[PDB]
């Protein structure tokens, strides 16, 4: 009681052997921009799948950077996360790793992982999350690998991991290692044929991240905002995800918002049986409570805590493409940007051009990148990007090399405290100053692939016809440009094409198609400036361009979908 018995037993067992076991390679462990996600039974039931991938990650690191180095390990709290973390501890011990900094019970949000990596000078980190995907025995499981800068491994590293995993023959593991992920503090293990002991530091999940955020924002003004008598009634929905504890400690305990403010803030291994995705579909409960009109501010997070959804009173949903534009138009309400200044704005291409309005009003440069973190991090490490956001509920700054949902919530709270206006009023002022960029996005999830790819090809060849550019459509829009978006990275000279079908109208409106069973994504972004037509239902003002997109793409006849699975 407590560490005593474990220490005496550790001494009685003596040094723990390190053994090499044979394995057969899999041919589908190809990690993308968001790590490697399969079904949970892939990692739980398939023999040596997890061991093969983890050993491939270790083999992807040079031996000179592996020996005494520190590696952050943490997840969002999914089913099977704990046992896989234990396997990571054993294999990491056998692969000669200096120390593993793990959050208590394996709980560390992706922004927290980036923060700790950049703080303790770690070689990297392994994040056990599938982000917004569902979790559980019949759900999805994912493994991300971040490097020493705090961000996800670039394509060369994730590659090398994949090519190694296709040919892996054996792995090293310390099977008799038993670590208690539940108790904070340091735990060392004597390894056989090794003189130096292996170290596992179980750290508080929230402490470091909360300290960083305490340096980013003015926690005093947030105290006066969330904890006072005249307090801003907030309703934060963590969707049973990783951010719950952070909401409890940061927003509720430290900043003083009472416990009523948080909901679904206890991480569950199945996320309560729902998709931890913050949008108008999977987070409809939050919008339905926001319909009551008692709360002035609402927000939702995803599985690993890099997404955020922002709602105002009576469910005044603000789209991410707009939200980043409001954060940029009021960027000096945050002390961090006061200290650093604004080096640049950036958005994913399918994001609405609302950010370009504040980027052109001020003269801070704006970079339009494809979907994915590689380009945002590329511009961040060159001191060219200060605030970024993507339509996929992505908002973040250069404080870390991952996007951060709770950071965006604290930024919005800072803007509300500074301006002393409601969310809706602030966005009305924004829409009148810059002109509203009506934005919508339709998600047709898991349609069969061949028909979707054939639609994108036939449609693509329809754009490529010179008789298309110029031709008009009635409600009246005129086609100006039509291409498949490509991007030349200004940092490393990288190229990336087939990033989405872009249709630019002389009106400034854009219709974008993208393909992710396969999921079809429809992005629609029109601009409007005259004051008599900026306060309407966006579905109605956008219905023309939606009809043009569905009719030109012939999507329903080729997919049988009647309505999109998700609306934004
Ligand atoms: Mg996520």
Closest CA to 115 of 226, 220, 218, 246: 246
* Cα distance between residue 119 and residue 91, in whole Å: 24
Peptide bond into 2 cis (omega under 30): yes
Residue 429 labeled ligand binder = no
Alpha-carbon distance of 87 to 93, in angstroms, equals 10
DSSP character for 269?
T
* Cα gap 514→453, rounded to integer Å: 10
Beta carbons within 10 angstroms of residue 357's beta carbon? 23
CA neighbor of 50 nearest in space, from 71, 29, 74: 29
Q: φ and ψ at 300, to 5 degrees?
A: -135, 145
Give the technique used to solve this structure.
Answer: X-ray
Residue 327 contacts residue 358 (beta carbons within 8 Å):
no
Phi/psi region, residue 229 (left: phi>0; alpha: psi -120 to 50; beta: rest), is alpha
d(C-alpha 206, C-alpha 261), whole Å: 18
Is 497 annotated as belonging to a binding site? no
Helix H segments across 95-154? 110-120
Interhelix angle 320-329/405-419, rounded to 10 degrees, is 50
CB under 8 Å to 64, separation ≥6 — which residues? none
Please check whether residue 398 is in contact with residue 389, taking contact to mean a CB–CB distance below 8 angstroms.
no
Residue 162 in tokens: 């994949």
Q: Is 463 left (phi over 0), alpha (psi -120 to 50) or beta?
A: alpha
φ, ψ of residue 299 to 5 degrees: the values are -155, 155
Beta-carbon count within 10 A of 382 CB: 13
Chain breaks in the chain (C to N over 2.5 A) after: 475, 516
Residue 346 burial (CB count, 10 A): 25
Find out whether 471 is annotated in a ligand binding site: no
154: DSSP letter? P
Residue 60 CA to residue 160 CA, distance in Å, equals: 6
Gap between the terminal Cα atoms of the chain? 53
Question: DSSP letters along 543-559, please?
Answer: HHHHHHHHHHHTHHHHH
Nearest to 135 by CA among 2, 254, 38, 234: 38
DSSP secondary structure string, 502-541? Answer: EEEETTS-EEEEEE--EEEEEEEEEEE-SGGGSSS-HHHH
Beta bridge pairs of residue 338: none
CA of 530 to the centre of ligand 1 (A): 36
Q: How far is the CA of 126 from the centre of ligand 1 (A)?
A: 15
Supply angle C-alpha 47, 51, 57, rounded to 5.
145
Q: What letter would DSSP give residue 444?
A: E
> Within 10 A of 69 (CB to CB), how many other CB atoms are there?
17
Surface-to-core class of residue 531, CB atoms within 10 Å of its CB (0-12 exposed, 13-18 middle, 19+ buried):
exposed
The answer on whether 371 is annotated among ligand-binding residues is yes
Distance 4 CA to ligand 1 centre (A): 39
Retrieve residue 205's tokens.
Answer: 């999940």
CB 304 within 8 A of CB 312: no
Q: How many CB atoms are located within 10 Å of the residue 229 CB?
A: 4
Q: Give residue limits of the domains in the chain.
A: 1-205, 206-315, 316-435, 436-568
Contacts of 433 (CB under 8 A, 6+ apart): 329, 361
Q: Are the CB atoms for 445 and 277 separated by under 8 Å?
A: no
Q: Token pair for residue 15?
A: 């040094």
Within 10 A of 143 (CB to CB), how many other CB atoms are there? Answer: 24
d(CA 464, CA 340): 44
Three-state secondary structure call for residue 429: helix
Angle, helix 423-434 to helix 320-329, in steps of 10 degrees: 80
For 538, the token pair is 């966006």
Residue 218 Cα distances to 336, 394, 564, angstroms = 9, 22, 41
Q: Do strands 477-484 and 501-505 pair parallel, antiparallel, or not at all (unpaired)?
A: antiparallel
Residue 111, CA distances (Å) to 108, 184, 217, 296, 395 in order: 8, 20, 16, 26, 11
Resolution expressed in Å:
2.8
Task: Please tell me the distance from the alpha carbon of residue 103 to that of residue 201, in angstroms, as a whole number.
Answer: 8
Give the torsion through C-alpha atoms of 419, 425, 430, 436, to 10 deg.
Answer: 160
- Separation in Å, CA 97 to CA 20, 88, 188, 299, 565: 16, 11, 12, 39, 45
Q: Tell me whether residue 419 is annotated as binding.
A: no
Contact 160, 122 (CB under 8 A): no
Dump strand ranges (E) for 30-130: 36-39, 70-75, 99-107, 124-128
Question: Where do the DSSP E strands lie in 272-364?
Answer: 297-301, 308-312, 316-318, 345-348
Asked whether 309 and 299 are in contact (CB, 8 A), the reply is yes
Strand order in the sheet with 345-348: 366-369, 345-348, 387-390, 394-397
Q: Using CA atoms, how far apart are residues 3 and 183, in angstroms rounded to an integer?
A: 9
**Scanning the structure block, which residue is given the tokens 């919005």?**
412
Closest CA to 551 of 474, 482, 480, 498: 474
Would you state the structure tokens that stand for residue 451, as one six-digit string? 């028909």
189-211 burial, b for 16+ CB within 10 Å, e for fewer? bebeebeeebbbbbbebbebbbe
Query: Number of C-alpha atoms within 13 angstroms, CB side, residue 163?
Result: 7
For the chain, what is the total number of helices (H) and then of strands (E)?
Answer: 19, 27
Mark whether 148 is an active-site residue: no
- Any known ligand binding at 60? no
Query: Is 523 in contact with 514 (CB distance < 8 Å)?
Result: yes
DSSP class per residue in 339-380: HH----EEEETTS-THHHHHHHHS---EEEE-SSHHHHHHHH
Find out whether 77 and 304 touch, Cβ atoms under 8 Å: no
Task: Cite the DSSP H helix spans in 398-515.
Answer: 405-419, 423-434, 449-464
Q: Give the integer Cα–Cα distance in Å for 253 and 258.
A: 8
Catalytic residue from among 60, 131, 333, 509 = 131
Sign of CA pseudo-dihedral 304, 489, 397, 295? negative
Sign of CA dihedral 494, 500, 503, 509: negative
d(CA 482, CA 460): 9
Strands 394-397 and 99-107: unpaired
Phi first, then psi: what are they for 146, rounded to 5°? Answer: -100, 155
Rounded distance from Cα 531 to ligand 1 centre (Å)? 36
The CA R_g of the chain, rounded to the nearest whole Å, is: 24
Question: 527 phi and psi, to 5 degrees?
Answer: -115, 145
Q: How far is the CA of 278 from the centre of ligand 1 (A)?
A: 10
Length of the chain equals: 568
In the reported structure, the alpha carbon of residue 7 is separated from the centroid of ligand 1 by a whole-number distance in angstroms of 38
């Amino acid at each position: 009681e407590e560490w005593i018995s474990g220490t005496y037993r550790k001494m009685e067992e003596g040094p723990l052997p390190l053994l090499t076991f044979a394995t057969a390679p899999y041919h589908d462990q190809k990690p993308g921009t968001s790590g490697l996600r399969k079904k949970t039974y892939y990692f739980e039931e398939k023999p040596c799948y997890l061991e093969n991938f983890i050993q491939s990650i270790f083999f992807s690191i040079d031996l000179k950077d592996r020996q005494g180095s520190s590696l952050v390990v943490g997840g969002d709290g999914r089913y099977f996360n704990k046992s896989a973390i234990e396997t990571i501890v054993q294999m990491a011990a056998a692969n000669g790793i200096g120390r593993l900094v793990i959050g208590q019970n394996g709980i560390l949000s992706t922004p927290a992982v980036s923060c700790i990596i950049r703080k303790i000078k770690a070689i990297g980190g392994i994040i056990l999350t599938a982000s917004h995907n569902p979790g559980g025995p019949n759900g999805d499981f994912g493994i991300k690998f971040n490097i020493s800068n705090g961000g996800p491994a670039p394509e060369a590293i994730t590659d090398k991991i994949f090519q190694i995993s296709k040919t892996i023959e054996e792995y090293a593991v310390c099977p008799d290692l038993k670590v208690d992920l539940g108790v904070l503090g340091k735990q060392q293990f004597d390894l056989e044929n090794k003189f130096k002991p292996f170290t596992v530091e179980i750290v508080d999940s929230v402490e470091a991240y909360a300290t960083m955020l305490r340096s980013i924002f003015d926690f005093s003004a947030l105290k006066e905002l969330l904890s006072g008598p005249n307090r801003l009634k907030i309703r934060i929905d963590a969707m049973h995800g990783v951010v719950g504890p952070y909401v409890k400690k940061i927003l509720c305990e430290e900043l003083g918002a009472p416990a009523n403010s948080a909901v679904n803030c206890v991480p569950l291994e199945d996320f309560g049986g729902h998709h931890p995705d913050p949008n108008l579909t999977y987070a409809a409960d939050l919008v339905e409570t926001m319909k009551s009109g008692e709360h002035d501010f609402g927000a939702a997070f995803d599985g690993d805590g890099d997404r955020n959804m922002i709602l105002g009173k009576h469910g005044f949903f603000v789209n991410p493409s707009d939200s980043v534009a409001v954060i940029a138009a009021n960027i000096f309400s945050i002390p961090y940007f006061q200290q650093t200044g604004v080096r640049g704005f950036a958005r994913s291409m399918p994001t609405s051009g609302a950010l370009d309005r504040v980027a052109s009003a001020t003269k801070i440069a704006l970079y339009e990148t494809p979907t994915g973190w590689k380009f945002f991090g590329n511009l961040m490490d060159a001191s060219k990007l200060s605030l970024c956001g993507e339509e996929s509920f992505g908002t973040g700054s250069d404080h870390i090399r991952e996007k951060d949902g709770l950071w965006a919530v604290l930024a919005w709270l800072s803007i509300l405290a500074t301006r002393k206006q409601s969310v809706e009023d602030i966005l009305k002022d924004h829409w009148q100053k810059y002109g509203r960029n009506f934005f919508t996005r339709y998600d047709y999830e898991e349609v069969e692939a061949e028909g979707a790819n054939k639609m994108m090809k036939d449609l693509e060849a329809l754009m490529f016809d010179r008789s298309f550019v110029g031709k008009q459509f009635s409600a009246v829009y005129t086609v100006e440009k039509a291409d498949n978006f490509e991007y030349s990275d200004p940092v490393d000279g990288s190229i990336s094409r087939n990033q989405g079908l872009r249709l630019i109208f002389t009106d400034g409106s854009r219709i974008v198609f993208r393909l992710s069973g396969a999921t079809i994504r429809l992005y629609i972004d029109s601009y409007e400036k005259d004051v008599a037509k900026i306060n309407q239902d966006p579905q109605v003002m956008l219905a023309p361009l939606i009809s043009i997109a569905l009719k030109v793409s012939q999507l329903q006849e080729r997919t049988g979908r009647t309505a999109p699975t998700v609306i934004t």
